[PDB]
Design a binder for this molecule. Structure first.
Ligand SMILES: CCC[C@H](NC(=O)CCC(=O)O)C(=O)O
Ligand SMILES: CCC[C@H](NC(=O)CCC(=O)O)C(=O)O
Ligand SMILES: CCC[C@H](NC(=O)CCC(=O)O)C(=O)O
Lengths: 332, 332, 332
């Protein structure tokens, strides 16, 4: 059974076929690839873009999305095996996944880490659980990686450059400031897709403490080695932005401080200048700026940069709709 | 780009065309004016009638509604420009409106005031924001005016009197009691539509303190001057209800006390007798009673009056469904 | 006007016709029995299976479900008559039911007891209210009985035994442990349907205090007397499970302690061994095990029993989808 947990699990041919099916669904939004079909969108965290583009994607293709929010409307779920359920959890993923498997044809899941222990959050339990117990294809709507976002990003970039081949482009994934520590998911996905496309990735971040988990630093290397691109870590703003083509911002808490965020505020608070402004963007080769959103103005990007005609954020967001229909149409 | 923020923004011909398209959709509920189309219903406050009649209206016309609740499921939104977003808000209306503009064809928004400062609530920021940043038509689902409610009311009244011409009818918009201060939205809309239809409007309320904001008192005058109706403020119950044809109840907090509600409870608490009962209703010319709902029994209206065959509240409510399909079918 | 409040309100012929229409909808899930129609699913409590199978059932039949949650998104509702609504409730069921009656074609309601006074919870006020004030058929989605669950259970049992005639089968409805006291709804429904099918029902529970309300003990008797089955209460685990064919587990708080749960914890806490494990299940005539779900592992059933090929829980759950389409298709 094929799922869409990560882009890394897919061959470059399938990924490419996806982006093309996306480009296609963008010219003809209505279809019946999902006629009479349905998808259960399980959200364990907030969502605007994802929730809306899936529900509309299912509709536009003849299917129907059922949005569930364990804890709010649906009963809370347990993921640990053998555990004696006398706590907050009402049922186990083993039952829930099989039950959903009788109602729907596809299951999408969104579950951000708990931020209490990266050793535990990085195992990606929820997604793995759904994938194991579900008889229908499971789709990652973001956990510790955001694969759907990756494709919406890659398509927006290809559209911008008017070509599918993005090799030779200087890609700069940059950490950016945020009052609180956030999920590395989008960053891990930016790196994975940016290196997979064969670009010149530079992971700009404040201190070595902000470097992404090794899993993604290694996926990145394997991707570089096989796409003819390159990976490079930096801690100098100007040198990085220096004549770049693409600039992706994303704020995230330093993994080494997971569970012990107290002594991290003082650290991140002394780097608010990583904010993408006109200055950095100027140092770029007439580069394009984007962010996964929700983006906080004058904190991550400045009003100027967002209002800049070089910000392809809204196009990337809109592509979430097209790229996801490509994934569903494929998995069924 | 045409929106449906207020009925005042529309000509009497368009309004009339709307009510007729509504009367029409009431004879043939199913259609395809919205086939393959969709609408994002953004609620920043509770809703039963509105939420249900839009979601069903979109369905009945071949489209699809996506209900979003910023703060609950969707990320919380910021409306002030330039502000440095390091607070509760996760993204800005400038991004959200443009993003929705890529997914849906219509955007409905509901946002009651915050009741902390009328000077600020009366600017109608949220609706104005959506209208400014959105590339698709925006629909007011209630903020400081309730335009959709207006039309559902006007249609129910016309249906009752068996004619579209409501001139010469004695309309009495009356304040009514409620344990807590409420939005003037429906009252401002009752006045706006009642005077726009050319009726003999009497704004009955406890003390001059309860008179509606000048904006609506002036819209009302312009409407009277152009419809051949009349406007009149009263503080005497009996004299008002006196041989009236229509009676609309709506409880709202006194604007002069916005932000300082403490000294208002004692005031409103000494006017519970404004409750619409059989007595007042008797003093009317076999008048009809209605309320926008949700209505609290034995507080705003008495069990008797609600169960009275002269209460056209449920018909008005039901018309929300028909009148709104007329608005959507028009805006697309 | 016909509703689906309880299976007891229906003749054995109609029930049978239902299960057959369900078996039929299971072979052809898509249909148009509800084309252009809609149903308002009112939930006053959490739900996963119910919410999803109704929303999908409505879709699969050409209709559309509108999910409402009074208190969360919809305005909170009042059910007592004459009461002076100056409290938490914003509107009365008398208005709400009539309003919904203008938007939808069917109304489903879910409202668990409040657990403060069984004398009050057993009157089944909410469901009765909707049934009284609504002009469209009302459907019980669970209150103090779970009729939809009953049929999903009966169909799963018939499917298992490869026959519609379940007479002569030893059915054992067993109480099971749970950290907190729960609704007897499913138990009352298990008993009602198990005796209605003409099986040999044994209501196994800890102490006489755990025996179901008389209403259901009497419905049960009338059902036994008319189906040729039998009813029997037990307090001995082994003797009951002893060569049984079906075993249904369900945890519920003892009625005699409703409102005074403090002195019940110590009581239920000394019966955790009622948990359905391999041992009890072995003492059965190669029996089948099922539970309505959400089920807590190693508390109500053991991992073993749930993973056992004799657990028809997921099939019962899946049948909720088919049996409910039979009910809707019928009521319209
Ligand atoms: C279909 C069962 C619904 C409900 N169950 C609960 O409320 C138990 C929830 C839990 O154990 O968390 C009940 O007991 O009636
Ligand atoms: C697509 C991004 C989702 C999420 N973002 C947040 O949780 C930040 C929310 C905020 O700043 O309010 C994240 O960081 O992964
Ligand atoms: C259509 C009316 C919506 C809203 N009503 C309330 O917020 C009153 C709610 C209550 O009384 O519980 C208002 O006053 O504008």
């Amino acid at each position: 059974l094929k799922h869409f947990l990560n882009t890394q699990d897919w061959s470059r041919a399938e990924l490419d076929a996806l982006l093309t099916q996306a480009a296609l669904f963008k010219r003809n939004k209505l279809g019946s690839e999902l006629k009479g079909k349905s998808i259960a969108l399980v959200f364990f965290n907030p969502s605007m873009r994802t929730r809306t583009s899936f529900e509309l994607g299912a509709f536009q293709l003849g299917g129907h999305a059922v949005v569930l929010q364990p804890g709010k409307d649906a009963w809370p779920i347990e993921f640990n095996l053998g555990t004696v359920m006398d706590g907050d959890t009402s049922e186990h993923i083993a039952e829930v996944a099989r039950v959903l498997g009788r109602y729907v044809d596809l299951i999408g899941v969104r579950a951000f880490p708990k931020f209490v222990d990266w050793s535990k959050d990085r195992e990606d339990q929820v997604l793995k659980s759904f994938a194991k117990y579900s008889p229908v294809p499971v789709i990652n709507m973001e956990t510790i990686t955001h694969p759907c976002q990756e494709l919406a990003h890659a398509l927006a970039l290809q559209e911008h450059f008017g070509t599918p081949d993005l090799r030779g482009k200087k890609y700069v994934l940059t950490w950016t400031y945020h009052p609180k520590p956030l999920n590395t998911a989008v960053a891990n996905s930016a790196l994975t897709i940016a290196t997979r496309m064969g670009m010149d990735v530079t992971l700009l971040c404040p201190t070595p403490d902000y470097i992404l988990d090794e899993r993604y630093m290694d996926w990145a290397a394997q991707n570089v080695a096989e796409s003819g691109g390159s990976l490079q870590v930096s801690h100098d703003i100007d040198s990085a932005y220096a004549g770049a083509d693409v600039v992706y911002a994303k704020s995230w808490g330093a993994l080494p401080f997971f569970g012990n965020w107290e002594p991290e505020k003082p650290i991140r608070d002394q780097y608010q200048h990583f904010i993408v402004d006109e200055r950095k963007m100027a140092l770029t080769n007439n580069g394009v700026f984007s962010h996964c959103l929700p983006l906080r103005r004058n904190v991550k990007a400045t009003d100027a940069v967002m209002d800049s005609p070089n910000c392809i954020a809204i196009d990337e967001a809109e592509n979430r709709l097209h790229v996801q229909k490509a994934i569903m149409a494929a998995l069924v």
